[PDB]
Write a protein that binds this ligand. Structure first.
Ligand SMILES: NC(=O)c1ccc[n+]([C@@H]2O[C@H](COP(=O)([O-])OP(=O)(O)OC[C@H]3O[C@@H](n4cnc5c(N)ncnc54)[C@H](O)[C@@H]3O)[C@@H](O)[C@H]2O)c1
Ligand SMILES: NC(=O)c1ccc[n+]([C@@H]2O[C@H](COP(=O)([O-])OP(=O)(O)OC[C@H]3O[C@@H](n4cnc5c(N)ncnc54)[C@H](O)[C@@H]3O)[C@@H](O)[C@H]2O)c1
Ligand SMILES: [Fe+3]
Ligand SMILES: [Fe+3]
Lengths: 406, 404
């Protein structure tokens, strides 16, 4: 029953931290850097912010900018083959969850060209006690994650997910050997995020912290960070959304908050909100953060039925939502009211139906969604052990915009 | 103005985590382990808890158990020479701040026998590139007090025997590769060690929260350490091993305070405590306990503001009442600390800690000057004058509250 707190060697942050952190990459003696990113970030000059600094110091650079919305095995393999040819001694992921997750798997494949993806996907889908260990990492290259959304927190986590394009099946990988060697959290890179990305990333971060706090693997080492992320998000996410680049402090606070939520869930994991959000995302092509935003309130209601209900009340107290003499039930209602108001000002629809999913389509798939969500690796940390029938009820309630009632 | 959050690769915790973490040391392929500890911990079988597990797996072991309070250059050099002869691939510090700090410097000397101590002391006193670490050996810190948090920090201090001068080293290459926080190792701590370590931890978290280098990445951890300490230190001191939950919570709290100050640093409480400790041989945690309330009063002087931050701590700890103004929140924070100190048997003044008046008066100017110069001073939210530090020291000597 040993627990842990496992983070990157260095997390660097503050506006302008990117070039300063890169100077350490240089002085560490790195000579060949592969940047892994997407087309938007390349076309908008974000990768140049990395390569210009490295080139000035005589570091050879290559940029792979072909990561798309969800990392696919074909793209990961292509990136790995570029690594095989270019031979980087540092891989630098630049972007949101998609480039960061893709880069982690490219890194494994580069370190171990003998290893088939099937071996990785079937053996290392979760964190658990094992006899056979993850293949040794960081021999050919170190991994740096530069996050440009606020955010997935992938820059500090042992997690990656890749879609097998041949079948559409998503494969989660998890091992602390995939935790980046360095995370760079520079809010200059998120000043121009559109409103939808700001909202979805921010509510993803809220969900990460919320699930990490009530997880059966929560501890005194993660609780403070989960609560801090929630406080920062409560205090700055509205302004970040409304004002964007006009309020750089709010953008910076939220960028930090998403990483801090990462610190918590990297160690405490998540719950059934993520389980269900994964399946909604895959089935209906709803962005991850939106899917979480749609489900989180009903998951709280469900989990609140070391009771989770006491923990939710602790969050209410931390966020200043409760009044003296409030009972647990009332504190939870106040937590829910806060979340509902936050969702409203961030333009989140009130139901999956209002997010554009047709009723017949939903009903035809809801049983499969419920079964798959039960089976999801995220379910194991949820404080309430679910039945498939209960997850179905949550999904239906969320589709029709009803509050879950036990 | 880049900031950072830098911790050991792994922090492992919970009662019984030591043997479980050691199994990972074994499976990582370590073959030769040097344990660095003190005589008390060796004689009470604490080192055997490590060596028995490693030996059973065919790992060669050696123990250096000669670390004393205030590690000296002679002792560090002797430990380094043992490392040079034994050739460990892992160094495992076992103990409080003295073995942990000593082990960090032994590690550097073993990794770099070519390097003169003067080079290290004069170049790396304050957060050159540090000479590459972790080539010959990884560093594991196993803390047995609650505590210094040294198991997660980039700090070590050694005394030059020849002169009595203390040399702080600070670099993230000294951060352990692994910290092990196993409260089974602290169940039998005596009351004074419990008190002094606990109040050291309170001070670490308090100074890290109001430090000019505080950030959103450390603040939550500083507040968590303070909440854990408020909630469990009274029971830990009173009940000891009869309340293992409290002992466990406080052991975690000391490390969590470490997480905060490893990154946000400290302030003038530590600056003054270092000098009181060196001059009068007052234990570090006792020295901090004697000074912390007056440092709060000093730092809280009205013209973010430290005073707002202290009020935030009061709110976090549930010490404030609705409608309380900042001043009243701070008075409630101070009252909490005073009551905690009372339970823990902390003297009400430096005089009552056994320091003779003539001795104190003869040294107070030097204490004030040295405290100003201490590396810890730079992070303090109030930029001090030597005259003000002198006043704090005198007030604390005579048991008076500092008044602006
Ligand atoms: N299933 C899981 O466990 C899990 C968890 C996290 C991540 N993921 C995956 O990662 C992705 C989520 O990452 P994300 O939400 O951060 O976004 P993303 O990486 O999918 O990026 C989404 C879009 O935003 C753009 N973008 C990125 N940074 C920007 C910026 N600063 N300004 C403007 N546009 C920017 C990207 O170029 C892209 O077009 C999804 O594909 C999701 O499936 C999955
Ligand atoms: N800034 C820095 O670099 C830094 C960091 C840490 C500590 N330090 C210094 O090191 C010291 C910190 O020491 P500490 O408080 O951990 O104590 P310590 O290591 O000096 O040990 C104090 C005594 O407690 C005993 N002891 C330790 N663990 C015990 C246990 N579980 N049960 C019973 N007895 C036990 C030891 O054997 C010793 O006799 C201070 O002097 C401090 O200034 C400096
Ligand atoms: Fe998520
Ligand atoms: Fe201290």
């Amino acid at each position: 029953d040993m627990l842990w707190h496992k983070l990157p060697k260095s997390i660097y942050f503050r506006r302008g931290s990117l070039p300063i952190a890169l100077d350490e990459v240089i002085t560490d003696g790195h000579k060949r850097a592969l940047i892994v990113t997407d087309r938007f970030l390349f076309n908008n000059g974000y990768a140049d912010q990395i390569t210009s600094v490295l080139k000035a110091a005589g570091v050879e650079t290559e940029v792979f900018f072909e990561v798309e919305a969800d990392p696919t095995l074909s793209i990961v393999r292509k990136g790995a083959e570029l690594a095989n040819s270019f031979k980087p001694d540092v891989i630098i992921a630049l972007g949101g969850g998609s480039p960061m997750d893709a880069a982690k798997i490219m890194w494994v494949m580069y370190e171990h060209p003998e290893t088939h993806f099937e071996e990785l996907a079937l053996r290392f889908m979760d964190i658990r006690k094992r006899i056979y260990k993850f293949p040794k990492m960081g021999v050919k290259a170190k991994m740096i994650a530069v996050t440009t959304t606020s955010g997935t927190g992938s820059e500090v986590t042992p997690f990656a997910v890749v879609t097998d394009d041949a079948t559409g099946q998503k494969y989660p990988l998890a091992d602390y050997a995939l935790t980046p060697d360095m995370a760079i959290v520079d809010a200059n890179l998120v000043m121009d995020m559109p409103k939808s990305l700001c909202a979805f990333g921010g509510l993803d971060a809220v969900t990460h912290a919320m699930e990490a706090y009530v997880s059966v693997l929560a501890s005194e080492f993660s609780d403070g960070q989960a609560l801090q992320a929630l406080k920062l998000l409560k205090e700055y996410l509205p302004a970040s959304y409304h004002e964007g680049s006009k309020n750089p402090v709010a953008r910076e606070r939220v960028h930090s908050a998403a990483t801090i939520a990462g610190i918590a869930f990297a160690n405490a994991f998540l719950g059934v909100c993520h389980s269900m959000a994964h399946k909604l995302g895959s089935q209906f092509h709803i962005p991850h953060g939106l899917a979480n935003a749609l489900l989180i309130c009903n998951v709280i209601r469900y989990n609140a039925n070391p009771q989770a209900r006491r923990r939710y009340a602790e969050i209410a107290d931390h966020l200043g939502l409760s009044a003296p003499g409030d009972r647990t039930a009332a504190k939870i209602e106040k937590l829910l009211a806060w979340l509902e108001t936050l969702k409203a000002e961030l333009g989140i629809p009130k139901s999956i139906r209002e997010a554009g999913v047709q009723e017949a389509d939903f009903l035809a798939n809801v049983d499969k969604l419920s079964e798959d969500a039960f089976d999801d690796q995220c379910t194991g940390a949820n404080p309430r052990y679910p039945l498939i029938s209960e997850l179905k009820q949550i999904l239906l309630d969320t589709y029709y915009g009803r509050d879950y009632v036990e």
